[PDB]
Symmetry: C3
C-alpha cells in the first residue's frame, strides 16, 4: 500500500509466518509430553502474531482515533495479538520453572491488565488520559518483571530460564518506551519508525525467544 509502514508490516508478517512454519516442522515427532507443551505454546505465539501482522498489513487491524485534534491511525490489532501471545510467553517461562498455580494466575492476570489497559490507552480520545492508562499498564509490567525476578531446578532449566528472563526484561521493557514516543503517545517518532521498532521487538520476543527455548534440553523431562 501507500502507508509507508507497509514494508515493516509485510516483513513482520513474513518473519512470523516463517517462524511458525519452522517451529511446526521442528516439533514434528516430539513425543515427550513436557516438550510438547513448550512446542505448542511456542509455535502458537508466532502463528497468532502472523495473523495479526497480516491484519495490519491488509488494513483490517487499523482504526482512526481522534485526539489532540487530529485523526490518528492506531493499529489496534497489536493488542489482540498481545492479549494472547504475552501470557503464552509467560506460560513458557512459568512452566520451565514449575511455577505454582497461584504465581501463574498472578502473571497471566497482571499481563491481561497490562494489555487491556494499553488498549484502553490506545483508543482513548482525551489526550492526557492516554498517559494515565500507559502508567497503569506500565505498573502491571513492572509487577510482572518483579515476579520473574523475585517470585521463583535442574541446572539446564536454571540456565535457560535465566537467559530467557533476561531477553524478556530487555525486550518487554522497550515496548512502553516505543508506545510513549510513538503515534499512540507523544507522537515524537512517526508511525513508520514506530512500526519498525515494534516489528524488531516482536520478532525477537517471539521467534528469537522461541529459537532459544526450543534449542534447549530444558524443555524435556529428565529421561534415560
Amino acid at each position: 500500500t501507500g502507508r509507508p509502514e507497509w514494508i515493516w508490516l509485510a516483513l513482520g508478517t513474513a518473519l512470523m509466518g516463517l517462524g511458525t512454519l519452522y517451529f511446526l516442522v521442528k516439533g514434528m515427532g516430539v513425543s515427550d509430553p513436557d516438550a510438547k507443551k513448550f512446542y505448542a505454546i511456542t509455535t502458537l505465539v508466532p502463528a497468532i502474531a502472523f495473523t495479526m501482522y497480516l491484519s495490519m498489513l491488509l488494513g483490517y487491524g487499523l482504526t482512526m482515533v481522534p485526539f489532540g485534534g487530529e485523526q490518528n491511525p492506531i493499529y489496534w490489532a497489536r493488542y489482540a495479538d498481545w492479549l494472547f501471545t504475552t501470557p503464552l510467553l509467560l506460560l513458557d517461562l512459568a512452566l520451565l520453572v514449575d511455577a505454582d498455580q497461584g504465581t501463574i494466575l498472578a502473571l497471566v492476570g497482571a499481563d491481561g491488565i497490562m494489555i487491556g489497559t494499553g488498549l484502553v490507552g490506545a483508543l482513548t480520545k482525551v489526550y492526557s488520559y492516554r498517559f494515565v492508562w500507559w502508567a497503569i499498564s506500565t505498573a502491571a509490567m513492572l509487577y510482572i518483571l518483579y515476579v520473574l525476578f523475585f517470585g521463583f531446578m535442574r541446572p539446564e532449566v536454571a540456565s535457560t530460564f535465566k537467559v530467557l528472563r533476561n531477553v524478556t526484561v530487555v525486550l518487554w521493557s522497550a515496548y512502553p518506551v516505543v508506545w510513549l514516543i510513538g503515534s499512540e503517545g507523544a507522537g515524537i517518532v512517526p508511525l513508520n519508525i514506530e512500526t519498525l521498532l515494534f516489528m524488531v521487538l516482536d520478532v525477537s520476543a517471539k521467534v528469537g525467544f522461541g529459537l532459544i527455548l526450543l534449542r534447549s534440553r530444558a524443555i524435556f523431562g529428565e529421561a534415560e
Copy 2:
C-alpha cells in the same frame, strides 16, 4: 421477522434450547467426576449456541458489511458462538482420549485461530482479501483434523472416539464450503439457504454429537 432466514434461526434457537434442557436433566444426579466433565462441556455447548441463535433471531447478532459494492448482512454472532463452542467440542474429544496438555493447547489454539480468522474474513471490506482469511482459517481447520487423525485406551473409549472423530470431520469440513458459497464468500447461495445449512450443521455438531457422546459408557471412569 421479514428476513426470510428467520425460520431457520427460530428452529435453531428452539433445538439448541431443547437440547440444552435435555442434557441438563440427563446429567442430573451424575456423581462420577469424569462423567461430570463431559456433561458440563456437552451441556454448555448448546446453551451457548442457544444464546447466539436467539441473538441472530432478534437481530442483535447481525451487522451490515460493505463489500463488492453492496451492504451485506453478516451474522457475526455465529463467531462469538463458535469461539467458545468449538474448543469445548475439541475438549470433549481430547478428554475422551486422555490427550497430552500440549496437544490440547495445540488444538484449542489452532481452533481460536480458525474462528478468529474466519471472523476477520467475515468482516473484511476488501472482497478478494476475504478469501485470504478463509484460506488461513481453512489451514487451521486442516491442522485440527490432522491432529485428530495423527496426533493421538479402553475399547469403548476407542470406539466412541472413532465415531465422534468421524462425525467431527464430516460436519466441520462442510462449514468452510458453506461459507465459501454463501453470503460471506462468493454469494452463490442466498443467505436464507446458507442459514438453513449452518442450522443443520450446528444442531448435528452440537446436539447430535452430544447425544452420541453422552449415551456412551466411555464418559465414565472404570468402576466396579
Copy 3:
C-alpha cells in the same frame, strides 16, 4: 465531571484501588501454594475492577444506546469487569471446597453466559427484548446459586465456605434487581442512584468478600 454519578465512580475507583494495594501487601511473603492461589485470585478481582471503574470515571466505558426513543447512557465497562471477576470469585469458592473440574466448568460457563447475556441485554435497541436477555441471564444466575447450594472438608473450610456462599447469594441476587429498576431496564431509578447501588454491591462483593476470605485459615493447606 458533570455526570452526577461521577462521585460514585470516583469512590469505587478509590476503594477498588485501595483494596488491591491492601491485598497485594497482605499476600507478600505467602509461601503456601494453596494460599497463593487464593491471594492471586482475590487480589486480581479488585485490580480488574479498579481499571474498569476508572474507565467509567474517565468516560471511556460509557456508550449511548438508543431505545425507548431516547439516547440512553449505558456503562458497558461493567460487563468487561464482571466477565473476568465473577468467574474468579466463583473460582475462590470452588477451590475452597475442592470442587470437581466438571463443576468448576459448569460454574464458569454459566457465569460467562450470565454476563454475556446481560451485556447483550444492556446494548439491545428493542426495549422489550432487553428483558428477554435479563431473564436468560437471571436463569443462569439461578443455576449458579443452585450449584453453590446443591452441587457440593476441614471444619474451617466448611465454615468459611458457608459464610462466603451466603454473602455471595445476598449480594449477587441484588444485581438483577438493580439492573431491572435502573437505567438499563425499566428506568425507575436514575443512573446516579443505580451507580451508587452497584458501587456498594461491587465493593462488598470484591473487597468485602476478599477480606473475609483472606482472614480465614481455610486458605492454607493443613500443615504442622
